Design a protein around this motif. Structure first.
Motif, PDB file in Angstrom:
ATOM      1  N   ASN A 199     -24.382 -42.915 -11.098  1.00  0.00           N
ATOM      2  CA  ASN A 199     -24.188 -41.471 -11.099  1.00  0.00           C
ATOM      3  C   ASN A 199     -25.394 -40.676 -10.628  1.00  0.00           C
ATOM      4  N   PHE A 200     -25.138 -39.409 -10.329  1.00  0.00           N
ATOM      5  CA  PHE A 200     -26.177 -38.465  -9.951  1.00  0.00           C
ATOM      6  C   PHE A 200     -26.246 -37.582 -11.198  1.00  0.00           C
ATOM      7  N   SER A 201     -27.387 -37.557 -11.877  1.00  0.00           N
ATOM      8  CA  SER A 201     -27.540 -36.711 -13.061  1.00  0.00           C
ATOM      9  C   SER A 201     -28.217 -35.440 -12.569  1.00  0.00           C
TER      10      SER A 201
ATOM     11  N   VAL B 105     -28.395 -42.620 -12.321  1.00  0.00           N
ATOM     12  CA  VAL B 105     -28.106 -43.382 -13.541  1.00  0.00           C
ATOM     13  C   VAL B 105     -27.149 -44.538 -13.246  1.00  0.00           C
ATOM     14  N   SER B 106     -27.422 -45.700 -13.826  1.00  0.00           N
ATOM     15  CA  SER B 106     -26.563 -46.856 -13.605  1.00  0.00           C
ATOM     16  C   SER B 106     -26.607 -47.847 -14.744  1.00  0.00           C
ATOM     17  N   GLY B 107     -25.543 -48.636 -14.863  1.00  0.00           N
ATOM     18  CA  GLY B 107     -25.498 -49.664 -15.883  1.00  0.00           C
ATOM     19  C   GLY B 107     -26.232 -50.860 -15.300  1.00  0.00           C
ATOM     20  N   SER B 108     -26.355 -51.926 -16.076  1.00  0.00           N
ATOM     21  CA  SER B 108     -27.057 -53.103 -15.605  1.00  0.00           C
ATOM     22  C   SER B 108     -26.565 -54.351 -16.311  1.00  0.00           C
TER      23      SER B 108
ATOM     24  N   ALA C 211     -21.587 -42.458 -17.267  1.00  0.00           N
ATOM     25  CA  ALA C 211     -21.084 -41.204 -16.736  1.00  0.00           C
ATOM     26  C   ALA C 211     -22.013 -40.109 -17.242  1.00  0.00           C
ATOM     27  N   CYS C 212     -22.149 -39.041 -16.467  1.00  0.00           N
ATOM     28  CA  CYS C 212     -23.029 -37.950 -16.865  1.00  0.00           C
ATOM     29  C   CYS C 212     -22.240 -36.697 -17.176  1.00  0.00           C
ATOM     30  N   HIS C 213     -22.508 -36.114 -18.341  1.00  0.00           N
ATOM     31  CA  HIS C 213     -21.823 -34.893 -18.757  1.00  0.00           C
ATOM     32  C   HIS C 213     -22.037 -33.817 -17.687  1.00  0.00           C
ATOM     33  N   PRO C 214     -20.994 -33.021 -17.398  1.00  0.00           N
ATOM     34  CA  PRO C 214     -21.077 -31.964 -16.384  1.00  0.00           C
ATOM     35  C   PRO C 214     -22.027 -30.783 -16.623  1.00  0.00           C
TER      36      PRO C 214
END
Lengths: 5, 304
Positions: free
Chosen positions: B236-238, B246-249, B279-282
């Motif tokens: 994601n783009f935060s 942001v990313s999982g791993s 996921a990033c909150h809006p």
């Protein structure tokens, strides 16, 4: 099945 | 803020198998989750309170996405279909039939009159939300399609595949406007437009994330240090606070990088299995993460 192998 | 300081706030339990995807409603009030357990669950984004379970699929679900007004949801399942749901009633409004194998990814366009899906059958389909009929079937790739995303206004669609390619399509005509190619062609496990629609974030199964300027077809940034060579992990783009990626791993952590410097600014510890989705909150500095079978939970984190 993204959670998969 | 030079560096964020996300801290765990809630741990949401409920799913009985690995979680596959988590998405915040556009209005920021809900968090939807899909899982191999064939279920969709809705949770309160601010208090992490379980709201309801949405059932209907005959097999596991790999992805879910929200309509622009936060009222509808679409899910992609191994039962070869996608289903459109009314969030308030939990009822299945339509079942999108057409794919010949597992449906792996899905998204609504800004207007939300369209839905795009990617399947193991190597095709990308565009559907009419109102009728539930398939408008277009694109021979997008030569291997399973891992991700599909509409740009800012829905005029473009970007797809990714294990075939090693990332392609941009003209929604209206369905024609391929461009193909991003790599000379090593590692499977592209995820792709998504930047909020500005000018860049594309792509993950390859060689532990690498890249920020591309698709038009010019050039890589601008690369993020490394995390683990990703097995699963299709969301990135994601935060933008609510500082500008991060942001990313999982696959090492059970959530990585956060400074978009411009590419430096790792924080690693969230807590999950007990691969963090397959984030996921990033809006509007708020809130991150949601979900893990595979040995964990099965979704964690909500907040900073500031």
């Amino acid at each position: 099945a993204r959670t998969k192998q | 803020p030079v560096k964020p300081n996300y801290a765990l706030k809630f741990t949401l339990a409920g799913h009985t198998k690995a979680v596959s995807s988590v998405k915040f409603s556009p209005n920021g009030e809900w968090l939807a989750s899909s899982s191999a357990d064939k279920l969709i669950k809705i949770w309160g984004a601010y208090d992490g309170k379980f709201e309801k379970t949405i059932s209907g699929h005959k097999l596991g679900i790999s992805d879910v996405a929200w309509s622009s007004d936060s009222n509808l949801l679409v899910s992609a399942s191994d039962d070869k279909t996608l289903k459109i749901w009314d969030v308030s009633s939990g009822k299945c409004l339509k079942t999108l039939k057409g794919h010949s194998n597992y449906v792996f990814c899905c998204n609504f366009n800004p207007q939300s009159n369209l839905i795009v899906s990617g399947s193991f059958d190597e095709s990308v389909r565009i559907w009419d939300v109102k009728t539930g009929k398939c408008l277009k079937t694109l021979p997008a790739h030569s291997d399973p399609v891992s991700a599909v995303h509409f740009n800012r206004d829905g005029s473009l669609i970007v797809s990714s595949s294990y075939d090693g390619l990332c392609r941009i399509w003209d929604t209206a005509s369905g024609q391929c406007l461009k193909t991003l190619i790599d000379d090593d062609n590692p499977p592209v496990s995820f792709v998504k437009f930047s909020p500005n629609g000018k860049y594309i974030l792509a993950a390859t199964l060689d532990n690498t994330l890249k920020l591309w300027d698709y038009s010019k077809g050039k890589c601008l940034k690369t993020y490394t240090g995390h683990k990703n060579e097995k699963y299709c992990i969301f990135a994601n783009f935060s933008v609510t606070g500082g500008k991060w990626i942001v990313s999982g791993s696959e090492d059970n952590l959530v990585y956060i990088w400074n978009l411009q410097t590419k430096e790792i600014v924080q690693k969230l510890q807590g999950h007990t299995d691969v963090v397959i989705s984030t996921a990033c909150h809006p509007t708020e500095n809130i991150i949601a993460s979900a893990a595979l079978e040995n964990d099965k939970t979704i964690k909500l984190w907040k900073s500031d």
